[model samples]
Target chain A: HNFNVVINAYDTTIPELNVEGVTVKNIRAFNVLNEPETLVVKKGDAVKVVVENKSPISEGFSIDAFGVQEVIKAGETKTISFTADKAGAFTIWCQLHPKNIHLPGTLNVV
Target chain B: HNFNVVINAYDTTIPELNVEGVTVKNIRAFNVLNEPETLVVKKGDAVKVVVENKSPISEGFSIDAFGVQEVIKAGETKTISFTADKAGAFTIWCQLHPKNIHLPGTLNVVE
Candidate 1:
């Protein structure tokens, strides 16, 4: 059992997230283009991410490095579990909102 | 003489602005398109807007409703003066950055 963290990416502003022995990079919104934006995640021994989209509209969420993407309905919450066996930063982003408004998050693994 | 307010639109988050007898609307960033965004200003006796772009990149700033747009160099400050003679919200944004990152602000007037 490692650490379980929940990241809430709201539409107003970016949230600050930290995990012991891991590095979280670029939790800001993506450019004005692209879909399902990406965030850098550093794989750790045991890691779990719960991305909750609190926006009033439907948005997609996913981290492609580990094959994770799901449509997060308004007021909907989704949980993702994976073992950080890699040592690099991965991209993660929301699909629903425009590239400018797309939400982003990250997970650090050590 | 009405009111002199200063609005600082930074890159980190949106800043809140208020005028004694005016309304501020949609002070958030604009969509993924458009340039030299605009902000709504309620016509009042006197009004002044001081927008400062604190980003490391070159960005443009302006408010079209009243015909105000200028290139805001990095770490540069610009000021625009006008008398609010309208009663509607206008769109405001940056020309350099994408529409999503475009900054937004508003001004309200009261009788």
Candidate 2:
């Protein structure tokens, strides 16, 4: 019931990381330097994610399966909580400039 | 070429895990508790998985996309090596008694 998860979005540069049919050179990651983090949860669980935009520019966080779309300004922190009631893996990506450096993550509910 | 992955196959019990349209009661896991482990690897890299059957019965490990199928007896360990040349998620399951408690794992290869 108490899943205190925090995601820190950053605009940084890293080695080559190809995902979702795109090459991520200038990395935009959530809590990890390589790929975005994979959040695993069970079905029917309350999920809470606190996102902090540590980048210098504005960024949009989204998990379309839960209808979550919120914008966090530079160095701003926002909380996004939802119910993990669905099965299978759902995509978590930044809505702003998705084609640029938004590395796709997965919210896997088993 | 050095993965150093050790997967311990066990015959344990859990509450309930419904995956692949089936309810899992008697849990069959590889190095994890509730669910099977998710192995992440980069494409074009060499991967190796050493499986140790700690259960009382035999279990067969298979990753069909890589043509990996090997049976390990009780208290035995087997080595499985392959190349992660493809990008996608592949299923990892026990070929023996798949209907019983073979909790499927994942092999995710990204480019």
Candidate 3:
């Protein structure tokens, strides 16, 4: 399977918090805007992924199962290729900042 | 004067900081990518500034002197206009996050 993902980082303030006269701000948010909710592929299939970092800062991409880890520099594009030798569902997330931002995706091997 | 500012946010890892074998991740980084180091305008001039949020999150823009406070939503753009009533230097920063990121700029109101 071939895939291309683009990551976007942004700053935002939560609406109407008013916590003790202070508003909460979400300054660290990253998203893989081009990633589908779920990626489907067959087992033993060779996968090719092109990751593009469209944000102002760099981030690391990782699929822990396949031990595929790479850092996409800010405004830089990189590619990672792997084979789906195992069959199951896997999470695609950032290794640098894990699960904190909106930069999570799923990959399924059938 | 007319100005167009674009904001960008992104994740980064600080290079070579092995604090007891644990590396630090800089995920909460935001920058006003298109803002000049100094925005110079004349006193008593009406300034029109357009701010575009090209990031995944929302941000607030404020000059504080002209009482300009506005929140630019994610993937949204907003325009702010104000009169440079005072002849001094003021800060252009995000009201929400302060000076933690690279989003701070300077506004010079010259007489």
Candidate 4:
């Protein structure tokens, strides 16, 4: 079983992100920077990342943390697999709207 | 402020992981799989991870979840960073003794 991470533009109608807590679960999912934006894989598990684009513009995913780079245009789905043999926090970002910086996420190998 | 996730072998003298609840905290720090082994970061925080190996053997770290990979021998240290733009659970592990594989952990991003 796997989890799903939705990637879309920041909702304008929604109130701005404003939460104060120690752990992610401590805060609600209505805040900014997008909710639950990190991934956890075993050190050797084959990571299956499914990219779902919801906008008309294209974006790319760059991972200097895990040495990975890829792209996905609007309305397109892509998948990338890698051996998570490392133990640390790896950052995954999208090139969409560098201003906001594709709303980053984390990849962790325990 | 950030947190630290320790990556040492399951202490043998200590009892095995025995817990009955959700969340990593549910299990005792002495438990296996490493206590609080997960990392919780903001979508951008420029994550800083430090790998501390106690054994005297060589081990390689790999993360297909984020596209980073590297090796760490005994008494060595390394650091890495990435954009937490994407969301979901990404896994990490070490290549030391594939049998146990690397103790696994979780990364959660809240709003």
Best by TM-score: 3
> DockQ numbers for every candidate?
0.02, 0.02, 0.05, 0.04
Q: What's the true lDDT of residue A76 in model 2?
A: 76
- Tell me the whole-model lDDT of each prediction, alpha carbons only: 0.46, 0.59, 0.65, 0.52
- CA displacement after TM-score superposition, residue A8 of candidate 4 (Å): 0.7
- List the candidate numbers ranked by lDDT, top first: 3, 2, 4, 1
lDDT of 3 by residue, A1-110 (tens): 37888787654434445679888754434333335434556779899888888766667777777888888877899988999897545556677653434444556565
Model 4 Cα lDDT, one tens digit per residue, B1-111: 334433344322212222222111111112113223457655655666666555456655555656757676666766655666666766666645552334455555533
Error of 2 at B61 (Å): 1.0
Tens digit of per-residue lDDT, candidate 4, span A3-60: 4555564322233454574333222111114234667676687777776756445556
Worst 10 residues of 2 chain B by lDDT: B27-36
Candidate 3 vs. true structure, TM-score: 0.43
| i-RMS, each model, one decimal | 17.8, 18.2, 18.7, 16.7
- What is candidate 2's lDDT per residue for A32-77, written digit by digit as tens? 2112235666688677767666566677767888888888787777
Question: How much of the true A–B contact set does each candidate keep?
Answer: 0.02, 0.00, 0.10, 0.06
lDDT of 2 by residue, B85-104 (tens): 77655656667752123444
Using all chains and alpha carbons, the TM-scores for the candidates as numbered come to 0.35, 0.41, 0.43, 0.41
Candidate 3 segments exceeding 4 Å error: A1-110, B14-34
- Model 1 CAPRI quality: incorrect
Please provide, for model 1 over A6-92, each residue's C-alpha lDDT reduced to its tens digit, 9 standing for 90 to 100: 223333343453546533332344332221122223345444545455555666656676677777666666666776677766655
